[PDB]
């Protein structure tokens, strides 16, 4: 597997937007034998390029860069904005523009990734045109795409990608569904089941994602057909993580004892710890991405500035309670040991 | 592990009510080295006892018997019944009595299980008084209880049970939650995550349940801390299964491409293939068990009699598409081979 041949351990640090995946995090994972990732989501092409440059200065080992697929245009947003009037007033800020870009600098970002190739590139919220994948392949870049159902996985393979990321419902953060509709609500697939379905649906390598916090779980997905495990929440609380202090603390806080998928913050299903904002607006959030994300960004930044976890997008997978606060490099070592220990037992 | 010492393969055939787990099914699983189960749910104490007697005549190997915990009493039911008036008329039958028993012959069933001990007894919909568990233990019976969260698992251990069954959201049929409330809605835990949480929460053996259809998935849960895998849907479509023909056929029917948790049929969250009945009544089903189950039984029986899968409780886990129609004994062999193959690879 070209992917696994790139790095020693079957461990991938999930790209996490919102200032989480700073170069220092990716670098530590890379130096420990795992695959570090940079998140291009919501950044400008230049912002992404600067991180890429900095990371190369921190490590010479393979790393990945994640990009968001452009979303098509399209009452609901006007109403939700109105319902947030109180949040804007309380945080003394203005809601963001729901009609901003929807491509997230896609064209410019691909230009950078093609002109100065990186080892790995993954896509979220859909599948790239097969010409984008072919061109990146020629450049020597391995391509990955997230799928949440066996059908989406088939689409990923059909596009010619090198590997598919099977993200189960337990996953923290944004669900990588290709198309969001109120019907998918309540129909999310558990990772162990999704992995098996995807493994029999496609022939390309599968990277398992969702709720993986221990080395034993990494051994579990490998046993079920995965080539590697992608972990987000586990690295979210490491020291190199750029996630706000209130967010890191919430992960193990008994007060935030539950997570759930919501469109409250971005307008697309994403798993977050249940808090005030989710409770109040979660039931009414419309399917409109990145429209809603633009709308609530000022709110989230204001909340983070104040240290108010109740107004933040507390992204977290179902294994958040097992999050460990230590250097990412040491976390990889611990994970590797747990993995070995589980293989031996099995 | 006293449990695993009982039978050679880490495979448990889940007890399945509704006439699915006939003695012939349990026997075939037992003879193949797995642990067969009889379902006492909704049967009378005598009905259960007759199956127990018959199964002993079919195999001398260890088997289990599953019993439902009595439920406490408690507008919603009156309204739901009204909404089903059309179903009753169409199927030309009368709705059942929502105020029937709620103990499901618990006292009488325990009397039988204590007077003539069986190898294993599992409980669903709660945890038995620790005196019930202690008495069964003295009789030489191993006890298991289903938990859906790490907290419920702790309760299972605290009661002194020999092992806990960690049932994830992917599971087919009835969720074994100890207490049902509209809050749990949307907060189900994926098996891979639940298993890890339960393994660190308790010290007793864990049996993993939910979406397991292949031997590789059995290797997966074992690697994550489970002592065995409990499979329902995989055995539901075997020849020895007593499930109606329309139910077995629906499992691999492209028309029924999705499952979801609903209270439509029983008044408690249970995963079923999405069909007409679920679509029409699922959004309005109240939390009232076994009240709703009593209410819809006549409807379900009428639908089954007519071969109308759209009016049946098509219980099925998320791996239903991988269901194989063959003797249960051969399914165990195939599962065992897949398991070995996965261990070797890992
Ligand atoms: C903090 C937060 C931010 C995330 N941001 C991204 C992102 O920008 N792009 C992406 O492809 N996935 C993103 N993910 C999803 C991860 O790729 C992965 O699917 C998820 O973290 C797996 O669950 P645990 O978090 O490992 O349960 C994010 C997840 C969280 C935790
Ligand atoms: C046909 C149907 C009926 C079931 N009946 C029972 C039951 O009476 N008692 C019980 O404890 N579990 C029952 N279960 C749940 C199983 O114990 C197990 O948790 C579930 O089948 C696991 O998922 P798959 O079905 O293995 O995904 C039933 C499941 C289905 C498939």
Ligand positioned closest to the Cα atom of A243:
1
Which ligand 1 atom sits nearest the alpha carbon of residue A123?
Answer: 11
B317 contact partners, CB below 8 Å, separation of at least 6: A193, B170, B171, B172, B173, B210, B211, B212, B213, B232, B233, B259, B271
Question: How far is it, in rounded angstroms, from Cα B299 to Cα B337?
Answer: 41
Q: Residue A163 corresponds to which tokens in the numbers above? A: 């590997």
Nearest residue, CB atoms, B213 vs list A196, A213, A317: A196
C-alpha distance from residue A170 to each of A113, A148, A211, A233, A339 (Å): 31, 11, 5, 11, 20
Q: What is the bridge-based pairing of β-strands A173-174 and A270-273?
A: antiparallel
* CB-CB neighbors (< 8 A) of B260 in chain A: 186-187
CB A68 within 8 Å of CB A41: yes
Q: Is the CB of B165 under 6 A from ligand 2?
A: no
Phi-psi region of A255 (alpha: psi -120 to 50; beta: other; left: phi over 0): alpha
3-state secondary structure of B163: strand
* CB-CB neighbors (< 8 A) of A210 in chain B: 190, 192-193
Q: Render B183-233 in DSSP notation, one character per residue.
A: TTTT-PPPHHHHHHHHHHH-SS-EEEESS--SHHHHHHHHHTT-SEEEESH
Q: Render B53-108 in DSSP notation, one character per residue.
A: HHHHHH--S-EEEEEEPP-----HHHHHHHHTHHHHHHTT--PPPTTS-SSTTHHH
Number of domains, chain A: 1
3-state secondary structure of B247: helix
Question: How far is it, in rounded angstroms, from Cα B285 to Cα B79?
Answer: 10
Q: Which residue of B has its CA nearest to A169?
A: B190
Q: Residue B215 corresponds to which tokens in the numbers above? A: 């031997």
B190/A168 CB distance under 8 A: yes
Q: Give bridge partners of residue A167 from the DSSP assignment.
A: A209
Question: How far is it, in rounded angstroms, from Cα A197 to Cα B322?
Answer: 8
Nearest Cα to A166, choosing from A133, A188, A137?
A188
State the Cα torsion B250-B255-B258-B264 to the nearest 10°.
Answer: -70
Q: Residue B7 corresponds to which tokens in the numbers above? A: 């039978």
CB B196 within 8 Å of CB B226: no
A117 contact partners, CB below 8 Å, separation of at least 6: A136, A139, A140, A141
CB A250 within 8 Å of CB A273: yes
C-alpha distance from residue A247 to each of A77, A307, A322 (Å): 27, 9, 15
Rounded distance from Cα A177 to ligand 2 centre (Å): 29
Sheet holding B163-167, edge to edge: B11-13, B228-231, B206-209, B163-167, B142-147, B120-124, B63-68, B36-39
Q: Render B116-132 in DSSP notation, one character per residue.
A: S--SEEEEESS---HHH
Q: Is the CB of A273 under 6 A from ligand 1?
A: no
Q: Residue A235 corresponds to which tokens in the numbers above? A: 């690295």
B183 contact partners, CB below 8 Å, separation of at least 6: none
> In terms of residues, how long is chain A?
346
What interhelical angle do A328-345 and A215-223 show, nearest 10? 50
Question: How far is it, in rounded angstroms, from Cα A1 to Cα A105?
Answer: 31
3-state secondary structure of B37: strand
Question: How far is it, in rounded angstroms, from Cα B88 to Cα B323?
Answer: 32
Ligand positioned closest to the Cα atom of A271:
1
Q: How close A260 gets to chain B, by Cα (Å)?
A: 6
Question: How far is it, in rounded angstroms, from Cα A76 to Cα B47?
Answer: 55
Q: Residue A96 corresponds to which tokens in the numbers above? A: 């963001």
CB B238 within 8 Å of CB B327: yes
Question: How far is it, in rounded angstroms, from Cα B306 to Cα A319?
Answer: 45
Q: Residue A264 corresponds to which tokens in the numbers above? A: 């409250």
Question: How far is it, in rounded angstroms, from Cα B75 to Cα B98?
Answer: 12
A197 contact partners, CB below 8 Å, separation of at least 6: A149, A150, A153, A189, B319, B321, B322
Interface test with B, best of A166, A212, A215, A220 (most B CBs within 10 A): A220
Label each residue of chain A as H, E or C: CHHHHHCCCCEEECCCCCCCCCHHHHHHHHHCCCEEEEECCCCCHHHHHHHHHHHHHHCCCCEEEEEECCCCCCCHHHHHHHHCHHHHHHCCCCCCCCCCCCCCCHHHHHHHHHHCCCCEEEEECCCCCHHHHHHHHHCCCEEEEEECCHHHHHHHHHCCCCEEEEECCCCCEECCCCCCCCCCCCCCCCHHHHHHHHHHHCCCCEEEECCCCCHHHHHHHHHCCCCEEEECHHHHCCCCCCCCHHHHHHCCCCCCCCEEEECCCCCCCEEEECCHHHHHHHHHCCCCCCHHHHHHHHHHHHHHHHCCHHHCCCECCCCHHHCCCCCHHHHHHHHHHHHHHHHHHC
Ligand positioned closest to the Cα atom of A272:
1
Q: Residues in chain B whose beta carbon is closer than 8 A to a beta carbon of chain A?
A: 168-170, 186-187, 189-194, 196-197, 199-200, 210-214, 216-217, 219-225, 258-261, 317-319, 321-322, 342-343, 345-346
C-alpha distance from residue A230 to each of A39, A76, A175, A233, B63 (Å): 14, 34, 14, 10, 39
C-alpha distance from residue B99 to each of B43, B77, B124, B302 (Å): 17, 10, 20, 21
CB B167 within 8 Å of CB B198: no
Nearest Cα to B110, choosing from B84, B82, B81, B131?
B131
Q: What is the bridge-based pairing of β-strands B142-147 and B163-167?
A: parallel
What interhelical angle do B215-223 and B191-201 show, nearest 10? 30
C-alpha distance from residue B84 to each of A11, B174, B275 (Å): 52, 21, 15
CB A36 within 8 Å of CB A98: no
3-state secondary structure of B115: helix
Question: How far is it, in rounded angstroms, from Cα B199 to Cα B141?
Answer: 23
Q: Is the CB of B217 under 6 A from ligand 2?
A: no
Phi-psi region of B337 (alpha: psi -120 to 50; beta: other; left: phi over 0): alpha
CB B48 within 8 Å of CB B17: no
A220/B216 CB distance under 8 A: no
Q: Give bridge partners of residue B142 from the DSSP assignment.
A: B120
Q: Is the dihedral of CA A128, A130, A135, A137 positive or negative?
A: positive
* Angle, CA of B253, B259 and B262, to the nearest 5°: 135
Question: How far is it, in rounded angstroms, from Cα A149 to Cα A296?
Answer: 29
Q: Give bridge partners of residue A145 from the DSSP assignment.
A: A123, A164
Which ligand 1 atom sits nearest the alpha carbon of residue A14?
Answer: 17
Question: How far is it, in rounded angstroms, from Cα A321 to Cα A14?
Answer: 18
Domain that holds residue A223: 1-346
C-alpha distance from residue A186 to each of A46, A262, B261, B282 (Å): 38, 11, 8, 12
User: CB neighbours (10 Å) of residue B217?
Assistant: 33
Which ligand 2 atom sits nearest the alpha carbon of residue B171?
Answer: 23
Rounded distance from Cα A167 to ligand 1 centre (Å): 9
Which ligand 1 atom sits nearest the alpha carbon of residue A167?
Answer: 19
Question: How far is it, in rounded angstroms, from Cα A206 to Cα A216?
Answer: 18
Q: Residue A134 corresponds to which tokens in the numbers above? A: 């072919």
Print burial letters for A248-282: b (CB count within 10 Å at least 16), e (below 16). Answer: bbbbeeeebebbbbbbbbbbbbbbbbbbebbeebb
The annotation status of B275 as a binding-site residue, yes or no, is no
Print burial letters for A311-344: b (CB count within 10 Å at least 16), e (below 16). Answer: bbbbbbbbbbbbbbeeebbebbeebbebbeebbe
Interface test with A, best of B148, B188, B192 (most A CBs within 10 A): B192
Q: Residue B103 corresponds to which tokens in the numbers above? A: 């103990």
Tokens 């490998």 found at: A222
Residue B10: DSSP 8-state: S
User: CB neighbours (10 Å) of residue A186?
Assistant: 16
Nearest Cα to B324, choosing from B334, B315, B314?
B334
Q: What is the CATH number of the domain that holds A251?
A: 3.20.20.70
Q: Is the CB of A269 under 6 A from ligand 1?
A: no
Q: Is the CB of A317 under 6 A from ligand 1?
A: yes
User: CB neighbours (10 Å) of residue A284?
Assistant: 13
């Amino acid at each position: 597997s070209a992917l696994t041949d790139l790095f020693p351990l079957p461990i991938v640090q999930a790209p996490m937007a919102g200032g989480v995946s700073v170069p220092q995090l990716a670098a530590a994972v890379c130096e420990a034998g795992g695959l570090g990732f940079l998140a291009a989501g919501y950044k400008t092409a230049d912002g992404m390029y600067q991180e890429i440059k900095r990371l190369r200065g921190l490590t010479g080992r393979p790393f990945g860069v994640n990009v968001f697929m452009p979303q098509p245009e399209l009452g609901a947003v006007e109403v939700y904005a109105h319902q947030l009037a109180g949040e804007a007033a309380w945080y003394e800020t203005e809601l963001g523009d729901p009609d901003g870009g929807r491509d997230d600098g896609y064209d410019a970002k691909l230009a950078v990734l093609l002109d100065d190739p990186v080892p790995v590139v993954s896509f979220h919220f859909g599948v790239p045109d097969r010409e984008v994948i072919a061109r990146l392949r020629r450049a020597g870049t391995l391509t990955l795409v997230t799928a949440t159902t066996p059908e989406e996985a088939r689409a990923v393979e059909a596009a010619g990608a090198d590997a598919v990321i099977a993200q189960g419902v337990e996953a923290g953060g944004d669900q990588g569904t290709h198309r969001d509709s109120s019907e998918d609500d309540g129909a999310g697939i558990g990772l162990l089941s999704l992995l098996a379905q995807v493994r029999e649906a496609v022939d390309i390598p599968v990277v398992a994602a969702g709720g993986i916090m221990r080395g034993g779980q990494i051994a579990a997905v490998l046993a079920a057909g995965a080539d590697a495990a992608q972990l987000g929440t586990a690295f979210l609380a490491t020291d190199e993580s750029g996630a706000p202090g209130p967010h890191k603390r919430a992960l193990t806080d008994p007060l935030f004892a539950r997570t759930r998928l919501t469109r409250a913050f971005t307008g697309r299903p994403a798993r977050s710890l249940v808090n005030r904002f989710l409770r109040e607006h979660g039931p009414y959030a419309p399917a409109a991405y990145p429209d809603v994300h633009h709308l609530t960004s000022p709110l989230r930044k204001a909340a983070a500035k104040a240290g108010d976890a109740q107004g933040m997008a507390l992204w977290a997978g179902q294994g958040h309670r097992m999050a460990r606060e230590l250097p990412a490099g040491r976390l990889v070592e611990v994970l590797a040991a747990e993995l070995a220990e589980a293989r031996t037992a099995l």
